[PDB]
């Protein structure tokens, strides 16, 4: 583990070093954010250097027409006055900071941020051609600047800004197999239409096919005209006013009919992927650093509302059922079931690539 990230303020005066950009949320514990900030050979003109980690919601404004314009609203802000060091604030260095100081000297001032564990992971919302500026959604950013006080108007070239991601990965143990079932009883009889469905497993990885086992016991006189299977991304978004959407990210419409007094068992296989979802502006993706492709967003995991973008997935299985009968076409006969599952990356061994690694 011999390389570290660095970025300098445009005027060289300030430089930020970090051991990584992705800090894993393991539900009860988040990797702390530790690096050093290097103040230059009296390129420095300001009287104090702080570092701040901000979790922010980034959005554009629909009412306006300024391409590239976005606004960042803070959800969590922390600061350190690391230059000059403040007494009554003694802290012990990480091993990373200890190495960095040996490499650089006493003018490398450390900073450590422990992240509150109840905060949203980095999520980006799918842009459309119109969206030309920065990626909307939820992002972390470490900021280093040199100023008189925390009230000072911060020159942009006196500062450095680095995007960092807060990410989760798949759990070791899979949950119970996802099974569901529903019974519809109709008006003049008691012989039901029964829908049983199940997924082959509870945790899936991005790009991995999802096998949906469908068991229809149609004891009725109605006919199942089609069977619709869809994978749906659910997004629960909270920024004082909440919002919510469910977006089909993969979908098969089988013209598989179930006769009256019939059973029907068929496996369906769907694979969520982004390529056939590019039209869907606002679809939730794993957080971007600048503009590289990311995958459909992984499932948010939570301890047993909360701000940011909570993502989750369900298979839906819907029987489209013929009408007629006593009520003509006025009442739906349809039958549906929903199968929750987890969609995530496996825990890696090395920190995942910053950019498109074949670029």
């Amino acid at each position: 583990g011999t390389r570290v990230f660095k970025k300098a303020s445009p005027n060289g005066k300030l430089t930020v070093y970090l051991g990584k950009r992705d800090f894993v949320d393991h539900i009860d514990l988040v990797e702390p954010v530790d690096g050093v900030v290097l103040v230059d050979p009296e390129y420095l003109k300001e009287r104090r250097v702080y570092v701040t980690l901000t979790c922010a919601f980034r959005y554009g404004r629909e009412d306006l027409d300024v391409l590239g314009l976005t606004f960042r609203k803070d959800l969590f802000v922390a600061n350190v006055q690391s230059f000059p060091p403040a007494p009554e604030d003694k802290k012990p260095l990480t091993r990373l900071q200890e190495r960095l100081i040996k490499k650089l000297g006493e003018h490398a001032y450390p900073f450590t941020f422990e992240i509150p564990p109840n905060l949203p992971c980095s999520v980006t919302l799918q842009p459309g051609p119109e969206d030309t500026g920065k990626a909307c959604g939820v992002d972390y950013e470490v900021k280093a600047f040199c100023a008189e006080n925390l009230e000072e108007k911060i020159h942009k070239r006196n500062s450095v800004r680095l995007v960092i991601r807060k990410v989760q990965y798949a759990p070791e143990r899979p949950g119970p197999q996802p099974t569901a079932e529903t019974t519809r009883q109709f008006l003049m009889s008691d012989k039901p239409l029964h829908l049983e469905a199940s997924l082959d497993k509870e945790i899936y990885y991005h790009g991995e096919p999802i096998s949906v086992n469908v068991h229809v016991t149609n004891n009725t006189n109605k006919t199942v005209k089609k069977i619709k299977i869809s994978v749906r991304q659910y997004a629960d978004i909270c920024l004082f006013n909440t919002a919510q959407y469910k977006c089909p990210v993969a979908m098969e419409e089988a013209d598989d009919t179930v006769a009256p007094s019939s059973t029907f068992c068929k496996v369906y296989t769907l694979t969520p992927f982004l390529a056939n979802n590019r039209e869907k502006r606002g679809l939730a993706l794993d957080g971007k650093l600048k503009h590289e492709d990311t995958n459909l967003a992984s499932s948010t995991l939570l301890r047993e509302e909360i701000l940011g973008i909570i993502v989750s997935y369900k298979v839906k299985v819907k029987l489209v059922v013929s009408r007629g009968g006593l009520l003509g076409d006025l009442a739906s006969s349809d039958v549906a079931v929903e199968l929750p599952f987890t969609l995530m990356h496996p825990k890696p061994k090395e920190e995942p690539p910053h950019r498109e690694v074949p670029e």
């Epitope: 990885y205 790009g207 991995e208 992927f273 590019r278 995942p352 690694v357 074949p358 670029e359």
Partner: antibody
Framework: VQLVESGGGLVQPGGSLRLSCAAS????????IHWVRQAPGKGLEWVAS????????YYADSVKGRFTISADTSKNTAYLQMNSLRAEDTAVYYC?????????????WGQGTLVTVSS | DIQMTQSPSSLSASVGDRVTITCRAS??????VAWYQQKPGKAPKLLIY???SLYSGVPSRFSGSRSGTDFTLTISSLQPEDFATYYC?????????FGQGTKVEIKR
């Protein structure tokens, strides 16, 4: 759990060929798929790649304009269709597999298919 | 593009010697380097990725290193098995590019 290439034989100069690479036992939307050619004893040359998860294809400037990488994900197979072939493109073409999340080298190679190009 | 020149390009040693192959990159490719072994008449196989990470199922004796734009593959003691040709690959920039090879033989 294997790659197997197909097609590939003798075709006159300026003609065309289509190779298929049948990917067995891994998920084509979680993997990228590449062709790599190795002339008779001269090292390794990347020629084209494709990401079905993201719908993007990439080429070496050597085969731009006359090679096309495609995928039929229903059949778990990829294709490299090769028209306007020179002697120079004579090689053992390899179908190699990559991990889509994320690229950590070509971790699996096909047994190769030979394509000679001469009159 | 990126040129990846493997230095030794051919070298002799005996079962149990400590060989090192090097590969210098045209420019900074970060750690996006893989190493590959290819036996004759047989398809290349993957040994090391990210410049330093051993691929699953590869003997511990194979090790990758990086020093800025310079990359080494060392084998700590040759076995009868691993007598082959070795290429390095950068994969930080389309077009990914290999090296010319380094043949290692028995030195009897």
């Amino acid at each position: 759990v294997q790659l197997v290439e197909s097609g590939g034989g003798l075709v006159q100069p300026g003609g065309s060929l289509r190779l298929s690479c049948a990917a067995s036992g891994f998920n084509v939307y979680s993997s990228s798929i590449h062709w790599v050619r190795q002339a008779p004893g001269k090292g390794l040359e990347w020629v084209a790649s494709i990401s079905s998860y993201y719908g993007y294809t990439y080429y070496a400037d050597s085969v731009k304009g006359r090679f096309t990488i495609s995928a039929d994900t229903s059949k778990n197979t990829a294709y490299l269709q090769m028209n306007s072939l020179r002697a120079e493109d004579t090689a053992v073409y390899y179908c190699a597999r990559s991990r889509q999340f994320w690229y950590s080298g070509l971790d699996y190679w096909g047994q190769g298919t030979l394509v000679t190009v001469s009159s | 593009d990126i040129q990846m020149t493997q230095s030794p390009s051919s070298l002799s040693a005996s079962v149990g010697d400590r060989v090192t192959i090097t590969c210098r990159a045209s420019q900074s490719v970060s750690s996006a380097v893989a190493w590959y072994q290819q036996k004759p008449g047989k398809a290349p196989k993957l040994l090391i990725y990210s410049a330093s990470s051993l691929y699953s199922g590869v003997p511990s004796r194979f090790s990758g290193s990086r020093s800025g734009t310079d990359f080494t593959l060392t084998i700590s003691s040759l076995q009868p098995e691993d007598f082959a040709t070795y290429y390095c690959q950068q994969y930080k920039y389309v077009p990914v590019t290999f090296g010319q090879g380094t043949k290692v033989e028995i030195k009897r």
